[PDB]
Design an enzyme around this catalytic site. Structure first.
Site, mmCIF file in Angstrom:
data_model
loop_
_atom_site.group_PDB
_atom_site.id
_atom_site.type_symbol
_atom_site.label_atom_id
_atom_site.label_comp_id
_atom_site.label_asym_id
_atom_site.label_seq_id
_atom_site.Cartn_x
_atom_site.Cartn_y
_atom_site.Cartn_z
ATOM 1 N N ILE C 157 -42.888 43.507 7.433
ATOM 2 C CA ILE C 157 -43.815 43.893 7.621
ATOM 3 C C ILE C 157 -44.719 43.887 9.860
ATOM 4 C CG2 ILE C 157 -44.643 43.201 5.620
ATOM 5 C CD1 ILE C 157 -46.398 40.961 6.799
ATOM 6 N N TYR C 191 -41.821 39.157 10.135
ATOM 7 C CA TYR C 191 -43.465 39.591 11.071
ATOM 8 C C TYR C 191 -43.408 40.134 12.316
ATOM 9 C CZ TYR C 191 -48.449 39.238 11.014
ATOM 10 O OH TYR C 191 -49.576 39.465 12.061
ATOM 11 N N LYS C 192 -43.319 41.486 12.297
ATOM 12 C CA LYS C 192 -43.604 42.171 14.015
ATOM 13 C C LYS C 192 -44.891 42.289 14.283
ATOM 14 C CE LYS C 192 -39.663 45.667 13.138
ATOM 15 N NZ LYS C 192 -38.924 46.392 12.854
ATOM 16 N N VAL C 193 -45.099 40.896 15.489
ATOM 17 C CA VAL C 193 -46.630 41.092 15.898
ATOM 18 C C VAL C 193 -47.080 41.476 17.394
ATOM 19 C CG1 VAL C 193 -45.992 38.832 16.724
ATOM 20 C CG2 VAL C 193 -48.833 39.350 15.715
#
EC number: 4.1.2.57
Lengths: 297, 293, 293, 297
Positions: C157, C191-193
């Site tokens: 995500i 998680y891609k932030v």
């Protein structure tokens, strides 16, 4: 028939003058505004004539060049009867990658013909460098004054400061003062000077710089628009005139922004004319205030 | 006392109107011109009052806002007696990272007080989007017309086209026509429209676009300066007036270039006033030529 | 066959991932770099395949899109055997004048076909806005996790913060934290932030911001290059990995600068590859230092 | 002890060289990137030493200046044992508003000390102008060759084309050929030349221009990065080497983009090093392909 500065002023005695005598520097502006290259001489001629037709009704004098527009403005009657014709007498010599590296008196300029065509003055650019010989600049100014005066033309000089040929010691503001110290009493009728500080910053510093300049010029003087943002030029004229200048010579600050826009004649009328008119109104206001001041003495 | 459009025109019957009613968009201009951030409300108030003092002598009407300058321009008599006061009646709602994402009638605007203070008109921005409900825009215009007319004020609407909330199908030029088809006969007294093609390109294409727009507006109309380079606006006014417009509303094209320059009052007098005077002279010229037809 | 994050990492256990799945945003980059308009779909397809051929040898995974390059990269074997294929599962919906105003699960994406073609993961962008419903974002993430897991694919995500639909109350840095508080334990595998502070300023402030973010993410995470200058991205990866990240996803910071240059295949090899290799070496260095703690 | 070009090449025989010897032009880059003015000499020294420490492991030679970093790189052992030290022997003379208007041999440069410190070569910029005397440039090159060779140092010359002092007749591409015709056989060991067409445009035109240049250079030559976008330099090295060049000298194309970014030592390692390494890999690839070609003859 001997003309005086009174033949190139507004009715107020102030100078409201337009320069359209730019040469290869004007070709380079057309190319940088996207005009198809190489830019033909006719693009400059058409701009120069259109500018004279649109703007000479609002100028006490217009400055033109033999190279691109003298013959056309004279033959098409482009110059309003209320505006004096000034002809450039300078030959620009390119070098070091710029169009105007050195300058001499243009020997192809014929003062007799200019006088018969109704011209009233000649203008000479003088490039000033700290490490070039003062005596050669003074000699060229003295020859130019005699060329003008012997034909009953007004003599206008335009000292422009450049960095030295050798070394990196260059204060532009001090150079403008040193050029006025040298050339400010050289026997011309009018001195055209660059605005201190490019007309930027607080009004008080601008006035003090313009007053120091007035102290070294012993003839009527006007400020050039060269290097002043068109938005700061009206204030520069108010400040320079407060310090003792008698008006302005405007080029790019009046006409540069419409270079390359469509409907050239419409743009000169609607964009450039209002700026030139406002500068004329400022000169009239400052000369009126000077008549009240010179009356307190 | 019932005002008409004749109370906000020059003696020629043309409109030469100045907008200084910009809000957070004007704060963002001050910050982008290097003013120290955050920019105080008083920086906008001082610019707006200075612009009214300097420029109202050359305008047939000036448009002001409650948020930053209404009280000051009224109390300091900043507006020349020859210039009508128009008050913004729009509440701008920010969203999606821009200051004006949606607009409603500003319920804090008091038309009775405006009328007692010598105001003659109200103006309402209408944001137009293809995928938003026409009937809600018409309903808001009809409520605004009745708010104006019930106080004897002139009603001015300003439809501004935006891309749809959903989709990438957006032709700006067709949107300006579709907004005029919808709102061009909505019972306001004056229509303020965006200039086709941002006033760019050959004069003939610009005139043809302006004539198509005139066909869908059934009230007097003026062009906004918004999105037209200040150097192209005078030609846009000539072309729009050739096609049937009755003048202009100028904001940024008159005053934006001096934002952040020193000696604000001097810059408004020497830079901004000559542009506003030239636009006034163009309107007088075009109205004179229309009378001789 | 059930894949894990260990099937999309380097031998070090870090992530060195390349995104070439950009859609209309990539068409707009080609036009702004002077490509003749309108820009054909085939210009994007050719860039995407060339980038996969040139750059997949230096990536632990590459992210591709059905719309412009999935079929071509699979049929031409453009992806090195040492690089895992990740497929975008997001449908971008344009609106308000931008290509990605909202996002839904792309129902044209076929996870069975992706799994048969050797794909190991799916990725879903989640646009986050303070005034949009948290429960709808969580519901979409939970449906996406189950879509991945039911096919033995890894679930990735990518929450991206946007200003609210209404209001001007937007702190980007606080939004990134609030999105991690909401979605940081939502049952995805990675998680891609977005990088705090766009990777700008003193290294200490950047580390403190990245540690606060690590506190609200309860799965492995990586930093996106999006909004970080390509010259600051290597330091951002060092700082993010100091604070607990396990590597990076790079798009524009690796390939954007050669868009519109001649000799595309040569530019990807000589300009873009050295940047992607250096980011890979940084991840190996940071993972080695983490093992010795 | 007499050094040859083999002492400044990679193991492949190609040249992969880094220039950090920029002087007032480097001060002006720091000011234009927002560093607080006036920019202290120590800002340049710290950049130059940091660049030598970070980048010399990837260079077959590094070019340094006495004015800002020679003493520091030598005393702090900044230069990797695998990288040859080249010292600039040129004195830059400002003029006409630019830092390098003319150039002479720097008489403060001590070749004995350079040789004792482990230096292997000297480099001399030669400004080339069509209307300046060829014989003065040849005389200066001949004196410089003898200064190098008498100390067993390698002699490197760097002809850089400028517009004429007088006139506007200037074709940059023809000037680069005319400078190679004059100086391409002047008895130096290595020729550093500007890339034709600034490395822009179709690869075929770039190769044809580089081949014409190869025809007028009778010593090993390398391309400068000067005026080539850092993104086009790797292709320019491939094309120049296809046409007969033996590698590159890179300055701004390697280190300019991190000027004024924070964490200087980190930026040199992560941004600048990967570019310099890729240029080294290209030189090794082109020299390998040349060994197969020179074997077909």
């Amino acid at each position: 028939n001997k003309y005086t500065i009174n033949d190139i002023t507004r009715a107020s005695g102030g100078f409201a003058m337009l320069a359209v005598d730019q040469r290869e520097a004007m070709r380079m502006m057309f190319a940088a505004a996207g005009a198809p290259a190489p830019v033909a001489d006719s693009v400059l001629t058409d701009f120069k004539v259109n500018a004279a037709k649109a703007l000479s009704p609002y100028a006490s004098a217009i400055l033109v060049d033999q190279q691109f527009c003298y013959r056309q403005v004279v033959e098409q009657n482009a110059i309003a009867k209320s505006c004096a014709m000034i002809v450039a007498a300078d030959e620009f010599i390119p070098g070091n990658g710029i169009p105007v590296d050195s300058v001499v008196i243009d020997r192809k300029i014929n003062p007799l013909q200019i006088k018969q065509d109704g011209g009233k003055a000649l203008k000479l650019l003088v490039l000033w460098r700290s490490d070039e010989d003062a005596q050669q600049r003074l000699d060229m100014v003295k020859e130019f004054n005699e060329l003008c005066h012997s034909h009953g033309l007004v003599s206008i000089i335009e000292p422009v400061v450049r960095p030295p040929r050798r070394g990196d010691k260059f204060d532009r503001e001090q150079a403008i003062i040193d050029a006025a110290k040298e050339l400010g009493d050289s026997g011309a009728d009018l001195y055209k000077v660059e605005m201190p500080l490019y007309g930027k910053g607080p009004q008080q510093e601008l006035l003090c710089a313009s007053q120091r300049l007035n102290d070294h010029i012993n003839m009527p003087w006007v400020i050039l628009s060269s290097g002043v943002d068109e938005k700061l030029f009206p204030r520069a004229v108010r400040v320079a005139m407060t310090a003792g200048a008698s008006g302005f010579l405007a080029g790019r600050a009046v006409w540069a922004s419409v270079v390359g826009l469509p409907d050239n004649e419409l743009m000169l009328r609607d964009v450039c004319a209002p700026k030139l008119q406002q500068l004329g109104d400022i000169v009239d206001e400052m000369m009126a205030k000077r008549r009240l001041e010179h009356h307190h003495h």
